[PDB]
Amino acid sequence: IKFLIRQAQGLQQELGGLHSALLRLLATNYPHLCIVDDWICEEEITGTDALLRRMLLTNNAKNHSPKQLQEAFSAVPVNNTQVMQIIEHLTLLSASELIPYAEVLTSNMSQLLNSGVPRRILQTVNKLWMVLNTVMPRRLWVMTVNALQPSQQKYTQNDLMIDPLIVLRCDQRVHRCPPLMDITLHMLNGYLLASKAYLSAHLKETEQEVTREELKNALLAAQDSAAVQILLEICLPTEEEKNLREVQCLICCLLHQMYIADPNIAKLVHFQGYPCELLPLTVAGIPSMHICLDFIPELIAQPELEKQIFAIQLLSHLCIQYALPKSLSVARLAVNVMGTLLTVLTQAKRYAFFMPTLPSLVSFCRAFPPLYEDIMSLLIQIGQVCASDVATQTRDIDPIITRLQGSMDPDVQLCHCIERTVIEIINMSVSGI
Amino acid sequence: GKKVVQETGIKVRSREYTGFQVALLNKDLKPQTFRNAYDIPRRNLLDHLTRMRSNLLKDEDQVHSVPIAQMGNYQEYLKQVPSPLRE
């Protein structure tokens, strides 16, 4: 279908309405083929560089064959330059002549992940994979998934369109090799749309009422949200690290496209909240995240202390990256809510709600000198309320005598946290110019 | 015969403007995880995703848990159930 529709696009003068009707049917039933990143890459350039290069370099390329490439590839680690040479001549071929090589490349993508291969092989294989994607995506996606399963069912197209997260159940070595992560994200973005279409068709088929429709919608929303969630989990570093910068950038681009495609995903991923170690990354990586300043006011209203703690932390980085009147009109509300929760919260939760959100206040001060006296008032108030609570029950460090200056008690930890934050805000104000 | 329900605490503070109120939990939540998506907290997301997908490709709540004494109404269950067996 993809090949024929491209041919029809090319030839428009003859086919009067056939082109229009075909394109409507495609875009309405097969949305996992109308992904702009696929068709844009087709237009390439008008630079004729590829044409001129091919016309003068194909000649008689010593009759390269799928079996020839397979022979070299079975011993690629012993000889990598042979593989380099073969694929280098592969790149020149036209979008059609490449099909015979679909199995050879896709089937044997496992050992590419092995350490040592110069990333030129991977880049060239990615380019070839994109060329093949522009021609035959349906078969290619299934081939790639079943080739990248970890080291073993043979997933089918209909199987993947049901549970597309199957795409992410791949070799963990994939999450640290940029060129193949790109391909995995392409498949994921395709198959999420494909799943939408599949469910939409399935419900209409099985109708032989609304409850079902909004069940479909809820399922799709949760499905997109979960995909985003695992993607962010990928961005998180693994303990071994304690490449990743390229992987995070590619995930950032994909997330940006999803967010522009639909807002509700932005509103849902956040109401679920995600590990707050990632905020410093995403806030800058995804340029279309400023929208959060719309609903953070709604978010803070949620009863869950976890949700409120997340909201304030997010607002901290948003205020740094963007400094707008709306941002300040919400930053003020943040401090007011913190003051309110100070009054309304027992100590056991006061610790759990104030320790991981106080370092957020230095960010507000950095962003808004005007919103400063309120910050300092709240800081001193919380400081001395905690100090008063300290004396109520005997302590072993007794931070009171520290006035003239491990696993400790919660209140001592809270007081030390407030002291550190005040040191930090003083430093940022001194060096903030 | 009218019950009184505690309201969401409304705390406007003079230290999204002047009409804000941090919500207070209401016991009678009964969230519809299946009908709506903003429920399903992060931890159980995979479970509820798979369960919703199964439930669809094959109702609104997975657990009924009637707290009423109805658990001991074997009489009403019998009246629902037909039983024409007579000697």
Binding site: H290, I291, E298, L324 | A23, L29
Partner: peptide, 22 residues
């Protein structure tokens, strides 16, 4: 507002979206 047009940009002159309790 305008998720793709950016907050600092020249302006051109010429079904449950909320939490169940909220």
């Amino acid at each position: 507002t305008s998720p793709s047009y950016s907050p600092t940009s020249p302006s051109y002159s010429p079904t449950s979206p909320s939490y169940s309790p909220t």
